[PDB]
Amino acid sequence: SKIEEGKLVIWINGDKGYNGLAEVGKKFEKDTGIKVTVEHPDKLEEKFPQVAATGDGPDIIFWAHDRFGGYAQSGLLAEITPDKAFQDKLYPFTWDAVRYNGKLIAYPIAVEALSLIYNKDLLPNPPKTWEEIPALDKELKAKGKSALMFNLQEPYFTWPLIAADGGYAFKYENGKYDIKDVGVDNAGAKAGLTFLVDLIKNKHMNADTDYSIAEAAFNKGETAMTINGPWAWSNIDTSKVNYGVTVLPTFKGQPSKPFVGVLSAGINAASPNKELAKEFLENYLLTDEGLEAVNKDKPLGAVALKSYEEELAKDPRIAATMENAQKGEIMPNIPCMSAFWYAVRTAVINAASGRQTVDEALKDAQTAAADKCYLDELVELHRRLMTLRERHILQQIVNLIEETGHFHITNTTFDFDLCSLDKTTVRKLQSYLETSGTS
Amino acid sequence: LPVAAPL
Numbered sequence: 176s177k178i179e180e181g182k183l184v185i186w187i188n189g190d191k192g193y194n195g196l197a198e199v200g201k202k203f204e205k206d207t208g209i210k211v212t213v214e215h216p217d218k219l220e221e222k223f224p225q226v227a228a229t230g231d232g233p234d235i236i237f238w239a240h241d242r243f244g245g246y247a248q249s250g251l252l253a254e255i256t257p258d259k260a261f262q263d264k265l266y267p268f269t270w271d272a273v274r275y276n277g278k279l280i281a282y283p284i285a286v287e288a289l290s291l292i293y294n295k296d297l298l299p300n301p302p303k304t305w306e307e308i309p310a311l312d313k314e315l316k317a318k319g320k321s322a323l324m325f326n327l328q329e330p331y332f333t334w335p336l337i338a339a340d341g342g343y344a345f346k347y348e349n350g351k352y353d354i355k356d357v358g359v360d361n362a363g364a365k366a367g368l369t370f371l372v373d374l375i376k377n378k379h380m381n382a383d384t385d386y387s388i389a390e391a392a393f394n395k396g397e398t399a400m401t402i403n404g405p406w407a408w409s410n411i412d413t414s415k416v417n418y419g420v421t422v423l424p425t426f427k428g429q430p431s432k433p434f435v436g437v438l439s440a441g442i443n444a445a446s447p448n449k450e451l452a453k454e455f456l457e458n459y460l461l462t463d464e465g466l467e468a469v470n471k472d473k474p475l476g477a478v479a480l481k482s483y484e485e486e487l488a489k490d491p492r493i494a495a496t497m498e499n500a501q502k503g504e505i506m507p508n509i510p511c512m513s514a515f516w517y518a519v520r521t522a523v524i525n526a527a528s529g530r531q532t533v534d535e536a537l538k539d540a541q542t543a544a545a546d547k548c549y550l551d552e553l554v555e556l557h558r559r560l561m562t563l564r565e566r567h568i569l570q571q572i573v574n575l576i577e578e579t580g581h582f583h584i585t586n587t588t589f590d591f592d593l594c595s596l597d598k599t600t601v602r603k604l605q606s607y608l609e610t611s612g613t614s
Numbered sequence: 615l616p617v618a619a620p621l
């Protein structure tokens with residue numbers, strides 16, 4: 176109704192190969208007659224849920240998988256229905272990233288991880304550790320250059336260092352991703368954020384460095400190193416910098432742990448072109464020729480399609496992408512990921528600016544992210560409990576609540592508040608419900 | 615999040 180029928184509108188981030196994708200759209204148009212329009216609006220990961228909630232937006236949305244769980248929970252994405260033959264063409268782990276509540280909600284395209292990118296002319300052997308970067312910066316500053324510049328405004332770029340000694344922020348429990356009790360607040364994360372803030376205090380980095388500033392400095396030969404994903408490689412090729420792409424530096428002997436995003440393509444639930452979207456994604460884009468057209472414009476990283484990934488396997492930059500991906504953490508796709516990112520973004524900005532100490536910044540981020548994630552799991556458990564009818568199951572839930580004493584009885588009901596329960600009681604209800612055969 | 619079960 177609001178979205179035009181008989182054509183496809185695709186949204187993809189401005190840093191990705193939207194011109195290469197438009198070439199795949201011209202191939203679709205040449206074969207089928209259907210026009211494909213590719214757009215890259217600003218802040219599309221936020222603009223998409225705003226317009227799709229009103230039945231508007233693109234037919235197809237491209238973004239890393241982390242945001243798709245939140246879109247699916249709001250009813251914004253159509254369930255995808257590839258057959259076994261198509262599913263067998265992509266790596267099984269890529270399908271896991273786009274599965275939400277038992278259903279596939281997007282087509283996985285590529286596996287993205289940040290790497291350390293360095294200028295071989297300024298730095299033939301890149302540093303293996305973060306600890307050696309302050310003295311390296313001093314040496315390069317005497318020659319008119321800096322050691323490292325990377326986007327400090329987005330938590331995606333600073334998280335690898337924070338999590339190097341901090342470890343993974345999330346864990347899998349009772350059929351769901353849960354943020355750890357100290358996934359953001361631990362001493363290792365505090366050490367990582369302190370190291371980053373100390374780099375700024377010692378004038379080795381600037382708190383206002385953003386994506387454009389870092390990209391221009393590296394591509395103009397002003398800084399020996401940057402941190403970026405595969406999409407950035409084309410702009411460095413154009414600049415003629417002799418670069419290497421390698422493992423991120425270690426911190427306290429621990430590998431840096433980037434969040435691994437699976438660039439994925441979802442179909443808007445309001446689209447009147449769901450079958451055309453499926454044909455374009457399965458038969459045009461997710462082929463060697465389709466992925467090559469996008470890849471030639473801006474590299475995708477380690478693609479989800481087995482056949483084309485084998486043709487990209489010999490690229491040393493992809494081997495580095497995969498090595499960093501293995502050391503990092505696959506992003507969860509739960510709806511609270513939005514709150515997790517807002518909280519870490521705020522902690523890094525406040526620590527780097529002196530608004531808060533490192534300890535206060537991460538303690539507050541842990542509270543904000545864990546409260547939102549826990550609230551979502553409580554809302555879901557409340558929904559789940561309210562549909563149960565079977566006597567044995569209800570008796571056992573009530574038996575578990577009775578052990579705590581956190582309940583009240585009225586003339587007609589047995590009452591309790593999920594918010595007044597301890598997390599161990601909530602975990603026992605979740606564990607019992609997982610065994611009851613009900614969902 | 616109050617839950618009510620039939621008594």
Ligand SMILES: OC[C@H]1O[C@H](O[C@H]2[C@H](O)[C@@H](O)[C@@H](O)O[C@@H]2CO)[C@H](O)[C@@H](O)[C@@H]1O
Nearest residue numbers: 188190239241242329330331332436516
């Ligand atoms: O910084 C938080 C941000 O991180 C990720 O976004 C990445 C994205 O995955 C990459 O494809 C690339 O475009 O850079 C982005 C960071 O600027 C999460 O995917 C995103 O939801 C999150 O807000």
